[PDB]
Design a protein around this ligand. Structure first.
Ligand SMILES: CC(=O)SCCNC(=O)CCNC(=O)[C@H](O)C(C)(C)COP(=O)(O)OP(=O)(O)OC[C@H]1O[C@@H](n2cnc3c(N)ncnc32)[C@H](O)[C@@H]1OP(=O)(O)O
Ligand SMILES: CC(=O)SCCNC(=O)CCNC(=O)[C@H](O)C(C)(C)COP(=O)(O)OP(=O)(O)OC[C@H]1O[C@@H](n2cnc3c(N)ncnc32)[C@H](O)[C@@H]1OP(=O)(O)O
Lengths: 337, 339
C-alpha cells in the first residue's frame, strides 16, 4: 500500500504513451497471466517469444482472453531472422562471434528479444521469471548496450518508507543496490546521474542527490571519502541541470538540522530524495535493513543506464509484480526517447 | 524514547544493585554535573569529579545541585596519588618516548588523570566528551587503559531499538562497528564480532546470534570484499566457540526465517540474528542512520567496546538524560569486566 499511489501514476503514464514490450519467456504462466492483464488494461503492446502454436496452446490452456492482439515471434522461424542475425554479427563478430554461432544465438529468446529492441521493433524487454539475472543482463549489455555518455549500468530501488517527512512523501530512490560491487569514482558519478534521471522518469520527482559517505564535507577524511568527493565533482560536471551534492552522511542527507550544521548552503542536504551509496556492501545491506527493520516497501531492482530498458524479474515474482515492472519499463522507454 | 525505555530501566537497576565508581573528568561541565546529581540522588553510581575543589563546589552551588556533597572531587594539580599516577604513566609509556617532564604535564590533564584513576583500580569506568572531541577522549584511554585480554581493537556499537518487534530481541539489535574503525581487516572484524556479542550479553541480556553481513550469502556472490567477511567469520568462531556467529550473509538472510531456509540452511544464526556486524564503517555509519531516520528506530550509543575497563564518549550536544543513561551503561560494562 506504500507506493500504490505512485505505481498507479506509472501505469497511467504507460497507458497514455503506449510502449512495445518484449517478453522472451513466452511460455511462463506468471508472465502470460501478467501480459493478459497488461493488454486488458492497455498498459503496453506485448510481444511474446515462443513457438506460435505452443504459446497459443498455453494461452488457451490458462484461459486467457486478452492476448489475441499480442505479437508472437518464433525464434526458429520469422521474417527478420537474417536481418537480426546480420545485426548481431555487426555488433559481436569482432568480439569472437562466428556466423556459425550467431545463427545459434539469434534463436535464443533472450538474444532475439534484445535484437528486437535494438532494431527499434520494440521499446523494452522484461525477463527473469525463468532465467538467472546473468542470462538476462548479458545479452542486454552485449546487444542493447549503454545509453549515450554512460559505460555502466546499475540497479536502483524505489524505497517507499513510512517516514513521510523524508524524500517525496516517504519515497527515496537508492542505488547502486544490485550490480557494481565497488564503483570507481567515474562509475559512481554515472550511478548518480542515472538514478536522478530514473527519479524524474518513474517517480516524477525533482531529484536532489546525496552522495553518501561516513564523512560530511571533510569531517572524516579517508581514502574511501576521496572517491565520493571525486564522484560528486564528476557528476556535477556531467549534469549541470541536476542537484547533486556530497560527500555527506545519511543524517546530513535527510535531516535539516544536521544539514544546517554539517553541510550549510548545500541545495541537497536536509532535502535528499535520491541516495547514492559508495559500494554494493553499503547499498545491498542498507536497503534490506530499511525494508525489514523500517517496514519499508522496496520495488526493484530497476536497471538503469541501458540505451533501451531491460528489467530482470526474480524467479518468485508474482503476476502483480511482473505487471508493475512492465509498467516501470514502459516509463523508462518513454524517458529513453 | 519509549522503544528503549524498558531496557534502559533494567540497565539503571542493575547498576544500582552493584554500585560502581565512575570518573567524570569534565567536572565543571553543567550537563555532566546535573547528570551526576541525578545519578547520586538515585544511587546509580559513586561519582568522582575532576577539577579544582573550590571551583567545582562553586559550580555545584551555582547550578543549585543538592545531591553532590558526597561526590569525590580530585584536583588534578594537587591530590594524594599524583606521584603514584605519574610513575604509573611513565611505566606505561616510557618505551614510547614519554619523558618525566611530559608525564608531569599529562598527569594534570583531566582525561589522562581520569584514565590513570581507572587503570590503578581507583575507579571502574570513565565518561567524557561533553566538552571534548572523541579523539581527545579515546587517545588517553587507548594509551593508558588499553584493550581487554585477547583483543587489540576497540569498536563502537549501537543499541538499535526498532519498531519491527518480530526481529532481534523484541525489535532490539546490536550493530557494530558504526563509529571507530573505517576498514577493519578480517582479524579486526572477528574481534568486533566477539566484542559486540559479549556487549549484547552484558548490557542487553541478549543470547547473541551474530550475523557477519555482506552482499553475498554463503558464497552466492563471491568477490574480494566477501573474502574478508568469510575469513572474519572463521576467525571469530575459532576465538569464541561458546558464541553463535555465522556469515557471510545478507541482511535479509540474517533477519528473515524464510530467506534463511533458502540461502543459509543449517545456519544456527540466519533468520534469528540479533547482532549485526558490518564489513566497513561506510556500511555501519550509513545503515544505522537510515534505519534510525527512515525506520523511526531509536539508536543508543555509540558504546565503546574492547577496553580493559570501560570508557565512553558522549556527543557535544548530549542531553542530561543521555549522560545519565551512558553512565548507567558504563557501570554495566564494568560489572561485566570484573566478572
Ligand atoms: C561477480 C559477482 O558475483 S559479485 C557481484 C554481485 N552482483 C551481481 O551478480 C548482479 C549482476 N552482476 C553481473 O556481473 C552481471 O550478472 C553481468 C552479466 C554484467 C556479468 O557479466 P559476465 O557473465 O561477467 O560476462 P562478462 O563480464 O564477461 O560480459 C558481460 C558484458 O557486459 C559488460 N559489463 C559487465 N558489467 C557491466 C556494467 N555494470 N555495466 C555495463 N557493462 C557491463 C562486460 O564488459 C561485457 O561486455 P563485452 O562482452 O562487450 O566486453
Ligand atoms: C577521522 C578520520 O580521519 S578516519 C574516518 C572516521 N573515523 C572515526 O570517525 C572514528 C574516530 N576515531 C578516532 O579518532 C581514531 O580512530 C582513534 C582515536 C581511535 C585513533 O587516533 P589517534 O588517537 O590519533 O591514534 P594514533 O593513530 O595517533 O596512534 C595510534 C595508537 O592508537 C592505537 N589505536 C588506534 N585506533 C585503534 C583502535 N580502533 N583500537 C585499538 N587501538 C587503536 C594504535 O595501535 C596506536 O597505539 P600506541 O600509542 O601504543 O602506538
Amino acid at each position: 500500500p506504500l507506493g500504490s499511489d505512485l505505481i498507479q501514476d506509472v501505469i497511467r503514464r504507460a497507458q497514455e504513451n503506449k510502449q512495445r514490450i518484449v517478453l522472451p519467456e513466452g511460455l511462463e504462466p506468471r508472465t502470460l497471466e501478467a501480459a493478459d492483464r497488461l493488454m486488458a488494461d492497455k498498459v503496453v503492446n506485448i510481444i511474446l517469444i515462443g513457438n506460435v502454436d505452443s504459446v497459443k496452446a498455453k494461452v488457451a490452456e490458462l484461459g486467457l482472453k486478452n492476448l489475441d492482439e499480442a505479437v508472437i515471434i518464433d525464434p526458429n522461424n520469422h521474417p527478420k531472422k537474417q536481418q537480426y542475425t546480420d545485426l548481431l554479427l555487426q555488433i559481436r563478430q569482432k568480439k569472437g562471434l562466428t556466423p556459425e554461432k550467431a545463427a545459434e544465438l539469434v534463436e535464443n529468446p533472450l538474444y532475439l528479444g534484445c535484437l528486437i529492441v535494438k532494431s527499434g521493433d520494440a521499446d523494452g524487454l522484461i525477463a527473469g521469471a525463468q532465467n538467472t539475472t546473468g542470462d538476462v543482463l548479458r545479452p542486454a549489455l552485449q546487444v542493447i548496450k549503454t545509453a549515450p555518455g554512460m559505460t555502466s549500468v546499475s540497479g536502483t530501488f524505489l524505497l517507499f518508507t513510512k517516514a513521510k517527512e523524508y524524500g517525496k512523501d516517504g519515497l527515496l530512490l537508492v542505488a547502486d543496490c544490485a550490480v557494481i560491487p565497488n564503483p570507481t569514482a567515474d562509475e559512481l558519478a554515472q550511478i548518480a546521474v542515472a538514478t536522478a534521471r530514473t527519479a524524474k522518469a518513474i517517480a516524477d520527482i525533482e531529484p536532489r542527490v546525496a552522495m553518501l559517505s561516513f564523512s560530511t564535507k571533510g569531517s572524516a577524511k579517508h581514502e574511501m571519502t576521496d572517491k565520493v568527493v571525486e564522484a560528486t565533482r564528476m557528476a556535477q560536471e556531467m549534469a549541470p541541470d541536476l542537484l547533486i551534492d556530497g560527500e555527506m552522511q545519511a543524517d546530513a542527507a535527510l535531516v535539516e538540522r544536521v544539514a544546517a550544521l554539517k553541510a550549510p548552503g548545500s541545495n541537497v542536504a536536509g532535502k535528499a530524495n535520491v541516495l547514492v551509496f559508495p559500494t554494493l556492501e553499503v547499498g545491498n545491506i542498507a536497503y534490506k535493513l530499511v525494508e525489514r527493520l523500517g517496514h519499508a516497501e522496496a520495488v526493484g531492482p530497476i536497471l538503469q543506464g541501458m540505451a533501451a530498458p531491460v528489467n530482470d524479474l526474480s524467479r518468485g515474482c508474482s503476476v502483480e509484480d511482473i505487471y508493475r515492472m512492465v509498467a516501470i519499463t514502459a516509463n523508462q522507454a518513454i524517458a529513453a526517447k
